[PDB]
Swiss-Prot record:
The gene is LNPEP. It comes from the Eukaryota. Glycans are attached at residues 27, 58, 95, 105, 207, 213, 287, 364, 417, 491, 509, 587, 661, 677, 816. One of its GO terms (biological process) is proteolysis. Zn(2+) binds at residues 303, 307, 326. Binds 1 zinc ion per subunit. The record marks 388 as: Transition state stabilizer. Coiled coil: none annotated. The chain holds residues 158 to 1025 of 1025 of the full protein. It is found in: Cell membrane. This is Leucyl-cystinyl aminopeptidase. It comes from Homo sapiens (Human).
Amino acid sequence: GKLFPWAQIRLPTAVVPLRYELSLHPNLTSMTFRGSVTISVQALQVTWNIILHSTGHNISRVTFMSQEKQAEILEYAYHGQIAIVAPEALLAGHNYTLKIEYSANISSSYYGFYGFSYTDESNEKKYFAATQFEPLAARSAFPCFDEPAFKATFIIKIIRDEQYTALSNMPKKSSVVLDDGLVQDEFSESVKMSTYLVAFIVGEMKNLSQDVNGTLVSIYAVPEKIGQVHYALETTVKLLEFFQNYFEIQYPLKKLDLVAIPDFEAGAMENWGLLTFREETLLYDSNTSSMADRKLVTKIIAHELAHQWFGNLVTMKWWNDLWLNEGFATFMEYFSLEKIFKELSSYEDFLDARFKTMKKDSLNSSHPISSSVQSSEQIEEMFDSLSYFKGSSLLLMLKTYLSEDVFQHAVVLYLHNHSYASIQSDDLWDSFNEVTTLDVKRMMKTWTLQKGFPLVTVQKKGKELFIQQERFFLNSYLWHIPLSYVTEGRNYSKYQSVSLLDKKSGVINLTEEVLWVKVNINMNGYYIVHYADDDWEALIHQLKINPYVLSDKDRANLINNIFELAGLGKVPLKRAFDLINYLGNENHTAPITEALFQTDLIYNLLEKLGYMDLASRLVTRVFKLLQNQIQQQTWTDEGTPSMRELRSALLEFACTHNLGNCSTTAMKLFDDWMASNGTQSLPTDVMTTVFKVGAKTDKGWSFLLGKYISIGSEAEKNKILEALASSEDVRKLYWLMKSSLNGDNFRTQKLSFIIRTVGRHFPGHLLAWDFVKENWNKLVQKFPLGSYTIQNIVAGSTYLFSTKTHLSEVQAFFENQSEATFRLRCVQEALEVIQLNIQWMEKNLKSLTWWL
Ligand SMILES: *[C@@H]1O[C@H](CO)[C@@H](O[C@@H]2O[C@H](CO)[C@@H](O[C@@H]3O[C@H](CO[C@H]4O[C@H](CO)[C@@H](O)[C@H](O)[C@@H]4O)[C@@H](O)[C@H](O)[C@@H]3O)[C@H](O)[C@H]2NC(C)=O)[C@H](O)[C@H]1NC(C)=O
Ligand SMILES: *[C@@H]1O[C@H](CO)[C@@H](O[C@@H]2O[C@H](CO)[C@@H](O[C@@H]3O[C@H](CO)[C@@H](O)[C@H](O)[C@@H]3O)[C@H](O)[C@H]2NC(C)=O)[C@H](O)[C@H]1NC(C)=O
Ligand SMILES: COC(=O)[C@H](Cc1c[nH]c2ccccc12)NC(=O)[C@H](CC(C)C)NC(=O)[C@@H](O)[C@H](N)COc1ccc(O)cc1
Ligand SMILES: *[C@@H]1O[C@H](CO)[C@@H](O[C@@H]2O[C@H](CO)[C@@H](O)[C@H](O)[C@H]2NC(C)=O)[C@H](O)[C@H]1NC(C)=O
Ligand SMILES: *[C@@H]1O[C@H](CO)[C@@H](O[C@@H]2O[C@H](CO)[C@@H](O)[C@H](O)[C@H]2NC(C)=O)[C@H](O)[C@H]1NC(C)=O
Ligand SMILES: *[C@@H]1O[C@H](CO)[C@@H](O[C@@H]2O[C@H](CO)[C@@H](O)[C@H](O)[C@H]2NC(C)=O)[C@H](O)[C@H]1NC(C)=O
Ligand SMILES: *[C@@H]1O[C@H](CO)[C@@H](O)[C@H](O)[C@H]1NC(C)=O
Ligand SMILES: *[C@@H]1O[C@H](CO)[C@@H](O)[C@H](O)[C@H]1NC(C)=O
Ligand SMILES: *[C@@H]1O[C@H](CO)[C@@H](O)[C@H](O)[C@H]1NC(C)=O
Ligand SMILES: *[C@@H]1O[C@H](CO)[C@@H](O)[C@H](O)[C@H]1NC(C)=O
Ligand SMILES: [Zn+2]
């Protein structure tokens, strides 16, 4: 009771961790554990108190090791900090060794060292423990310096029962039977790393493996699935051979372990050496899995294997620069997939994700990509689309402005100079300046330190393009925007070129008279282009004549930007429906999915406001544009991957709004699969549509719930859950959320997926927002504040409100909560989403009733 000696969230810099040794004896029978942390520290200045991070620990002994003395420990729970009062002052340059012995519980949630139970194929209950330490949960398990810049080497010693296999970051040195009959395994010392990338797993698993030039790649899973792990190994082996070639640095360890965990809230984690996953994101079966499920296992493996360089070998100094980890990993994920997995058309997801990140970055709720964070909530809210898909778009803009070979050299320089060290945003731009003349550092200062993105307005007047730049915002700093443009002349000849606008306005000369100009080729740039109308009509005439003279990316780029500029008010909504009246000649996915998104959004807003005959007049006119392409659809799994994704988009659009005979066809496919008893093989491209039509009946909804609790595909289960949660019976909708929240028949990791599916359609719109409000603090006690789960639920329960009544309701609810809860950007964003729904409906409702 001597006054905690530190009042700042961030630890002192006086003492640095040098070496860590943590031995743990978890039970999982008792769901408690006992741990011993021995930390080698260096004092860089005179010190009287070691300030450490510790959350949820009963300490029995703290000690120093010429004399072995006991130390006093104090605790300031608010900041999750413990202070160790030194017996004699610590001096600079002097190494010391502290040992803390403590007890704690295994956790209730998916964060920290956590445990769960699963029933086997034999009705056998088997236990499992695992770790999720990013962002700030390693202080739950071992007293540590829980800040990423305090890199160190780690020695894990885990005591286990013989039936379990204990995995960790490093390979096992050896395992000895102790006098208790229990085994204590020990792992080789680690590379210099962050505490959040530490990981240990305890559970009954099996493995399939292959050696790549000294590294044994191992994919684990619980034994009833080990045949379901072949696609992951080969993809891991192939993507491993790709990343060690492009980055020209090798995976430094001898084990690349990928584990499929039954209860995990995120899709995956990059824990060095031990990559954790969700069983749905790593396993795959040719017979029960979509192309979209295969297009996620290859994606998620590429994302976390690129974190082994971008995030583990090179790590950010503070969470303000999380985009240097997650934005590089997203970039390298889609870069890998365009080179060695091209036929999956992974660019369509990357393109679609950028459309959605730009809508959120257009709001005043947005922030600079690298902006200061201090609280735990702010650190948890950095795991957002901006850090992932705006960082991956800054890099895609720089790779396409510079050569693809100059980009590679900045990567090789930056990974070598900063290996096993911390980095900030300006360290990367310096690596671009050494391989280039160009001041990449000032070119990227406005894309990193200002919020939003620019709007390039474009006018063709003779043989010159006039270009001006503005911030894309509705109620000053300029950007060094690399412009690209393609143009066609008197002849079908198409010319591509590039420029850099660093001033408010500019002029480009064209050495020919042109038929039309298209700026931002394939949207390699993070900006929206608005044209003058004589230049917009040129692009709309061409679309109505032969749209295939433009790329798939460029035609989805125009659909997105035209509906986006129709909200800010720069264009009339009639103009965006003018454009998409060309879709009678479109049969490629990306433009169709994007037109279907905008159509479905306007339909989902109008329905809630009671305009049901206006909403159904919109879905049938879009159905009439796409009617030829929908009726040629086969209820099979035939075609290329992108043609398979288009098959499910067109049949889900048709069946969700009861258009055509499609629901009659899906109901027959369901009624045969049900008479089978779940036996008849269904094409994986029509399963969700089939299950959704069957779930609208009490027989099919009840049959489908019996398959949920009995089938072993966690991706066909995710397809049945969408059908169940798309019921029109609000008592069934309500019972699905209440069970996921409590963990009974649906795991709590699907609650956000349920709340999302429920709140999107008319029957459960109010039920979902009410359940979130009423159970708000149960959700905050399972998913940390600012987490992706909490951000996904706030956005998807509120984004379809469009009345001043709902704006004050949502605002007043969050004001009744903590200031930290109110100041979440996901909350401020949700409010702004609502405000823009009100304005869009006053501007474009009397005329949209005219066009329709
Ligand atoms: C942690 O401390 C524990 C002490 O509480 C130690 O745990 C005990 O270890 C024994 C044997 O090592 C286990 O004995 C077996 O457990 C099963 C329970 O599950 C099985 O049966 C049910 C019922 O059908 C079934 O659903 C399951 O699938 C299993 O088949 C017993 O039924 C068996 O007969 C057998 O006794 C204990 O379960 C376990 N706990 C307790 C409370 O007894 C543990 O070794 C310590 N671990 C470490 C790392 O130190
Ligand atoms: C439709 O399919 C489900 C499963 O997909 C069938 O339920 C299964 O019924 C069999 C009956 O032999 C059960 O197998 C045996 O269960 C008994 C009782 O537990 C046990 O003594 C044996 O060890 C053996 O496992 C099986 O457990 C059960 N599975 C489930 C998930 O319920 C159902 O009977 C089928 N119905 C029709 C009409 O085809
Ligand atoms: C299809 O499902 C998903 O789209 C989920 C969404 C999601 C659920 N939960 C999240 C939490 C944070 C961030 C995103 C999520 N995508 C992921 O999970 C991604 C893998 C993708 C990029 C292929 N994962 C990564 O990018 C990893 O590298 C982080 N470092 C994970 O960070 C964590 C921080 C706090 C946590 O509690 C758990 C993880
Ligand atoms: C599961 O993992 C084990 C251990 O990594 C694999 O067995 C090892 O295989 C390597 C490969 O050459 C050998 O160097 C070791 O001597 C083996 N160790 C033991 C204890 O057998 C095993 O092959 C993996 N399972 C499968 C199906 O591949
Ligand atoms: C095969 O193993 C060798 C040996 O590690 C790898 O050679 C490395 O190549 C990278 C390429 O830049 C060098 O930076 C490393 O220094 C090399 N290692 C050594 C020890 O010299 C090679 O990449 C491996 N190939 C595969 C496919 O895994
Ligand atoms: C198709 O029209 C394009 C539009 O310019 C023509 O491109 C020009 O070709 C001449 C050579 O005949 C060059 O001197 C010009 O510089 C080209 N244009 C530009 C903008 O540089 C192309 O010649 C036409 N195709 C033919 C004639 O086959
Ligand atoms: C462990 O669990 C107990 C009871 O479940 C709880 O009261 C306590 O705060 C937890 N933490 C520690 C350090 O024991
Ligand atoms: C601390 O350890 C480092 C690494 O071995 C060594 O260079 C240094 O001399 C040590 N200092 C003391 C006081 O032990
Ligand atoms: C926009 O955000 C700023 C701070 O980023 C805030 O001061 C202001 O109130 C917000 N609203 C408007 C309309 O600018
Ligand atoms: C459903 O409509 C499509 C559209 O032309 C047609 O090809 C198909 O034969 C129809 N099937 C039934 C059962 O009416
Ligand atoms: Zn990541």
